């Protein structure tokens, strides 16, 4: 697609999927799905959207606290409490008070499933009104010495005990990969107080505080005909609220384990489905729509459910709350967990790498995580890593000191010894100052990692510097230059106003010093892809043609358009085994010159067992 400029960005976010290789294309497409930039997310929303302005395709992963990110939940509102001693004689609608030293607070509680001796075994307590006197005085959520809880005076049927603990603030989910998917969502302890608080299995699809703005309604074929009086309830707060369901659906909940879902997100009735709990069953088009299956492919941008413990004939209001996205304390090594996403070819071909994007994060992170970046297009070498220098060493100072810290951080040396990024890849390209771009969405000037940036200016260009489009000042605008060139630095001058990219780019290595690069890489690339063909058939004489036509009509497609020149199809072409009658499996081995470099270079590509 120009050589298919894939890139691949792996950094934090305000909005999940949280460890998926989630696809972006537009800018209005990614803040949809990991949206504003947070000043603990910027340098990850600017370097993809940024990039986007020379961008086909973005492969992104967000990196999630695995330990203390959270998915917004309809557990999260309710409030500790043990049935210390189950009753007799209770029954199903008596009503509970939440005194507050010997004062009334809520009085809307009530016992909601006893069994046959009376013996309570569920009540539903609303937290409207006492989280609210509870943060009036101190006491959130803490709770529990001076807050106690009553029976009516009286239910039939007396001898109980309840127990109040505090104000549950943990969701108790995270929803990530989808290998986990609703195994996370049928863990003992989330499906416990499932059945405890007597709601369903509804959260909020992605890690994040952003998810509290998410409002599920649900109606069952019961209370749909009387979808307009039936006065749903709202959990955990309290409350009711005149349904809704009849008044959006045409087609209605058709079997009794039927339900309408209606979600919201700030008013807005951001979708409206209906499911069903009973597996097999299906619309009025053999669609299954069986919850867990349903969410299981895609089914919603917003929310997850499962049928497991969604209480019967249920309906009411749900409300999310309790969503946590952390990036708060996302861990340098968190950021690496994802970016191992991308090492692995045979899983994604992913062409460029937007590594600077960790310019700002904590000096050692911001080399160590890069650093390690590079170490997954070594190890693979179908990328290109491009990285950028961290904030602390070229942001603040003048370039006096300016360089001198660059260089020490490519070695050793003086103060960043320890946090050195003194490594040597052909594959390696760093990126040599810091951009200071205007944050549209904040609305603020910003320094963000040039290298995002460069990446798309790839992506671009042949195939995978001229200058770069919204920049409003760099960092730093001859010795140096030379020397940051040969350094393999990637540099932006500014010359009688507006800067521009003095070099090419690439921290190359041991190869010519010779854009000759992208022409290699992508014919290395595309090369390989060929691979599928040699299951297709057997291998021969013959096969030595065939393949080789094929690559070779390839190679000679580049020569035709211009890229590639001086092309022999004779002697730089492929025969693995040596000129002889013998011959073995056939590996791809090509000498190919870029059009402006006078000089051959033999890439050898296998195909083998």
Same mark, same amino acid.
């Given at each position: 697609?120009?050589?298919?400029?894939?890139?691949?960005?792996?950094?934090?976010?305000? %909005?999940?999927?949280?460890?998926?290789? !989630?696809?972006?294309?537009?800018?209005?497409?990614?803040?949809?799905?990991?949206?504003? /930039?947070?000043?603990?997310?910027?340098?990850?929303?600017?370097?993809?959207?940024?990039?986007?302005?020379?961008?086909?395709?973005?492969?992104?992963?967000?990196?999630?606290?695995?330990?203390?990110?959270?998915?917004?939940? /309809?557990?999260?509102?309710?409030?500790?409490?043990?049935?210390?001693?189950?009753?007799?004689?209770?029954?199903?609608?008596?009503?509970?008070?939440?005194?507050?030293?010997?004062?009334?607070?809520?009085?809307?509680?009530?016992?909601?499933?006893?069994?046959?001796?009376?013996?309570?075994?569920?009540?539903?307590?609303?937290?409207?009104? =006492?989280?609210?006197?509870?943060?009036?005085?101190?006491?959130?959520?803490?709770?529990?010495?001076?807050?106690?809880?009553?029976?009516?005076?009286?239910?039939?049927?007396?001898?109980?005990?309840?127990?109040?603990?505090?104000?549950?603030?943990?969701?108790? =989910?995270?929803?990530?990969?989808?290998?986990?998917?609703?195994?996370?969502?049928?863990?003992?302890?989330?499906?416990?107080?499932?059945?405890?608080?007597?709601?369903?299995?509804?959260?909020?699809?992605?890690?994040?505080?952003?998810?509290?703005?998410?409002?599920? #309604?649900?109606?069952?074929? +019961?209370?749909?005909?009387? @979808? &307009?009086?039936?006065?749903?309830?709202?959990?955990?707060?309290?409350?009711?609220?005149?349904?809704?369901?009849?008044?959006?659906?045409?087609?209605?909940?058709?079997?009794?384990?039927?339900?309408?879902?209606?979600?919201?997100?700030?008013?807005?009735?951001?979708?409206?489905?209906?499911?069903?709990? !009973?597996? $097999?069953?299906?619309?009025?088009?053999?669609?299954?729509?069986?919850?867990?299956?349903?969410?299981? !492919?895609?089914?919603?941008?917003?929310?997850?459910?499962?049928?497991?413990?969604?209480? #019967?004939?249920?309906?009411?209001?749900?409300?999310?709350?309790? @969503?946590?996205?952390?990036?708060?304390?996302?861990?340098?090594?968190?950021?690496?967990?994802? %970016?191992?996403?991308?090492?692995?070819?045979?899983?994604?071909?992913?062409?460029?790498? =937007?590594?600077?994007?960790? +310019? $700002?994060?904590?000096?050692?992170?911001?080399?160590?995580?890069?650093?390690?970046?590079?170490?997954?297009?070594?190890?693979?070498?179908?990328?290109?890593?491009?990285?950028?220098?961290?904030?602390?060493?070229?942001?603040?100072?003048?370039?006096?000191?300016?360089?001198?810290?660059?260089?020490? %951080?490519?070695?050793?040396?003086?103060?960043?010894?320890?946090?050195?990024?003194?490594?040597?890849?052909?594959?390696?390209? =760093?990126?040599?100052?810091?951009?200071?771009?205007?944050?549209?969405?904040?609305?603020?000037?910003? %320094?963000?990692?040039? &290298?995002?940036?460069?990446?798309?200016?790839?992506?671009?260009?042949?195939?995978?510097?001229?200058?770069?489009?919204?920049?409003?000042?760099?960092?730093?605008?001859?010795?140096?230059?030379?020397?940051?060139?040969? #350094?393999?630095?990637?540099?932006?001058?500014?010359? $009688?106003?507006?800067?521009?990219?003095?070099?090419?780019?690439?921290?190359?290595?041991?190869?010519?010093?010779?854009?000759?690069?992208?022409?290699?890489?992508?014919?290395?690339?595309?090369?390989?892809?060929?691979?599928?063909?040699?299951?297709?058939?057997?291998?021969?004489?013959?096969?030595?043609?065939?393949?080789?036509?094929?690559?070779?009509?390839?190679?000679?497609?580049?020569?035709?358009? @211009?890229?590639?020149?001086?092309?022999?199809?004779?002697?730089?072409?492929?025969?693995?085994? /040596?000129?002889?009658?013998?011959?073995?499996?056939?590996?791809?081995?090509?000498?190919?010159?870029?059009?402006?470099?006078?000089?051959?270079?033999?890439?050898?590509?296998?195909?083998?067992?």
């Amino acid at each position: 697609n120009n050589s298919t400029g894939t890139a691949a960005l792996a950094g934090k976010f305000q %909005w999940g999927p949280a460890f998926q290789i !989630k696809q972006v294309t537009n800018e209005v497409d990614l803040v949809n799905t990991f949206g504003q /930039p947070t000043a603990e997310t910027a340098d990850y929303f600017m370097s993809a959207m940024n990039f986007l302005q020379y961008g086909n395709d973005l492969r992104v992963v967000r990196a999630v606290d695995r330990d203390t990110a959270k998915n917004s939940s /309809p557990i999260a509102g309710n409030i500790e409490y043990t049935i210390s001693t189950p009753g007799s004689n209770y029954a199903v609608g008596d009503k509970i008070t939440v005194k507050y030293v010997s004062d009334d607070i809520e009085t809307e509680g009530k016992i909601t499933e006893v069994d046959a001796d009376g013996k309570i075994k569920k009540i539903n307590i609303p937290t409207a009104k =006492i989280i609210a006197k509870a943060k009036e005085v101190g006491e959130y959520p803490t709770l529990g010495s001076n807050w106690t809880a009553e029976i009516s005076s009286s239910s039939s049927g007396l001898a109980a005990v309840i127990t109040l603990g505090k104000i549950i603030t943990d969701s108790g =989910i995270l929803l990530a990969e989808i290998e986990n998917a609703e195994a996370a969502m049928t863990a003992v302890d989330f499906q416990a107080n499932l059945k405890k608080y007597g709601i369903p299995g509804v959260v909020a699809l992605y890690p994040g505080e952003l998810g509290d703005k998410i409002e599920i #309604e649900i109606v069952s074929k +019961a209370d749909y005909a009387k @979808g &307009a009086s039936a006065l749903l309830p709202i959990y955990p707060g309290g409350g009711t609220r005149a349904s809704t369901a009849k008044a959006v659906f045409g087609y209605g909940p058709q079997t009794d384990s039927q339900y309408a879902i209606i979600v919201r997100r700030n008013d807005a009735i951001v979708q409206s489905v209906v499911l069903s709990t !009973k597996r $097999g069953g299906k619309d009025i088009y053999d669609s299954n729509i069986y919850i867990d299956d349903f969410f299981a !492919k895609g089914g919603s941008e917003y929310i997850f459910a499962t049928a497991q413990n969604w209480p #019967e004939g249920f309906s009411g209001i749900l409300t999310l709350s309790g @969503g946590l996205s952390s990036n708060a304390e996302v861990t340098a090594g968190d950021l690496m967990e994802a %970016w191992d996403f991308f090492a692995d070819r045979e899983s994604v071909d992913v062409q460029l790498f =937007i590594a600077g994007s960790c +310019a $700002g994060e904590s000096l050692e992170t911001a080399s160590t995580v890069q650093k390690h970046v590079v170490s997954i297009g070594d190890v693979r070498q179908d990328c290109l890593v491009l990285c950028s220098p961290p904030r602390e060493t070229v942001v603040g100072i003048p370039v006096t000191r300016a360089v001198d810290n660059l260089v020490n %951080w490519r070695t050793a040396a003086g103060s960043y010894t320890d946090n050195n990024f003194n490594i040597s890849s052909t594959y390696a390209a =760093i990126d040599g100052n810091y951009k200071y771009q205007y944050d549209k969405y904040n609305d603020v000037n910003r %320094w963000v990692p040039l &290298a995002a940036d460069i990446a798309g200016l790839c992506a671009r260009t042949d195939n995978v510097r001229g200058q770069i489009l919204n920049v409003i000042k760099l960092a730093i605008e001859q010795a140096q230059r030379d020397r940051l060139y040969q #350094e393999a630095i990637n540099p932006v001058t500014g010359t $009688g106003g507006d800067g521009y990219v003095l070099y090419g780019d690439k921290t190359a290595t041991s190869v010519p010093s010779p854009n000759v690069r992208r022409l290699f890489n992508m014919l290395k690339t595309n090369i390989g892809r060929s691979s599928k063909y040699r299951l297709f058939e057997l291998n021969n004489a013959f096969t030595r043609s065939s393949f080789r036509t094929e690559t070779a009509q390839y190679l000679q497609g580049n020569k035709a358009l @211009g890229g590639i020149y001086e092309y022999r199809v004779v002697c730089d072409t492929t025969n693995n085994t /040596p000129s002889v009658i013998d011959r073995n499996e056939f590996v791809a081995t090509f000498y190919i010159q870029p059009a402006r470099s006078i000089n051959y270079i033999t890439l050898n590509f296998v195909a083998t067992a």
